[PDB]
Amino acid sequence: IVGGYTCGANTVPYQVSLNSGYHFCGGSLINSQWVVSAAHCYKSGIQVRLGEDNINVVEGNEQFISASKSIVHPSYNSETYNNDIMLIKLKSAASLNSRVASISLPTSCASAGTQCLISGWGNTKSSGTSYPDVLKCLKAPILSDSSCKSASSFIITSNMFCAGYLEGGKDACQGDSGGPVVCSGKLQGIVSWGSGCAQKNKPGFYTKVCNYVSWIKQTIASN
Numbered sequence: 001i002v003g004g005y006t007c008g009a010n011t012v013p014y015q016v017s018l019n020s021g022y023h024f025c026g027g028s029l030i031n032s033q034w035v036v037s038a039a040h041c042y043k044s045g046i047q048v049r050l051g052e053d054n055i056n057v058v059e060g061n062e063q064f065i066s067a068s069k070s071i072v073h074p075s076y077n078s079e080t081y082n083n084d085i086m087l088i089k090l091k092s093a094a095s096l097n098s099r100v101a102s103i104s105l106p107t108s109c110a111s112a113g114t115q116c117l118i119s120g121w122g123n124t125k126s127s128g129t130s131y132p133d134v135l136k137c138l139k140a141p142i143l144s145d146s147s148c149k150s151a152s153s154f155i156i157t158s159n160m161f162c163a164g165y166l167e168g169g170k171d172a173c174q175g176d177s178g179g180p181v182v183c184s185g186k187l188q189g190i191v192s193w194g195s196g197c198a199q200k201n202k203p204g205f206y207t208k209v210c211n212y213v214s215w216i217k218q219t220i221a222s223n
């Protein structure tokens with residue numbers, strides 16, 4: 001997160017860190033046994049870290065749980081970044097509490113102008129590199145489909161939305177990938193991609209979760 005604020009410990013209790021010896025992506029807890037993340041985050045040997053604020057220090061509310069299965073969406077295409085969503089099942093059920101909680105799936109898609117909460121432990125600078133230890137937060141509005149398209153030298157599919165600030169300065173970044181975009185108490189977005197971070201006319205793009213609820217629900221039922 002570039003140009004955001006310190007969330008405060010456990011204020012985003014569905015925020016999850018994916019660890020393979022180091023933090024590499026965010027995720028969202030959607031029930032006691034399932035995490036939703038980004039397809040482009042896939043890798044073997046993932047450990048899901050719940051209840052984190054400072055990811056470098058044992059603070060007392062962590063739950064670390066191994067992934068038992070990962071399911072990348074059938075149609076995830078890394079040349080297009082289309083369908084950038086993956087489900088991770090945990091080897092044991094998380095103990096749910098005030099600091100470790102699930103986030104509701106959307107029943108309907110969010111609209112342009114809607115203010116959303118985006119969070120992660122990703123890079124905090126548009127130029128250079130600084131990675132925070134505690135969780136950062138950014139409130140950003142969803143931007144129109146037309147301005148999203150105009151502000152991108154890549155192809156934008158209907159399973160993407162963009163959000164943030166065309167002026168620049170405020171955006172998610174590398175390391176935030178996979179993490180939540182929460183709008184009116186529903187998981188609407190997954191940090192998917194951006195051309196650099198927080199640059200002029202280079203807004204953040206996110207996986208349109210509302211499009212996937214049926215697949216999410218059916219896959220969980222069956223695994």
Ligand SMILES: N=C(N)c1cccc(-c2nocc2C(=O)Nc2ccc(-c3ccccc3S(N)(=O)=O)cc2)c1
Binds near residue numbers: 081191194204
């Ligand atoms: N600024 C952001 N919102 C953001 C969020 C997460 C990661 C990064 C990021 N931090 O550094 C680089 C990054 C990046 O995402 N680069 C990037 C650019 C384009 C694509 C892409 C988009 C559509 C089709 C194809 C591609 S791709 N993968 O072929 O290039 C993928 C990744 C930035």
Ligand SMILES: [Ca+2]
Binds near residue numbers: 054056057058062
């Ligand atoms: Ca910690």
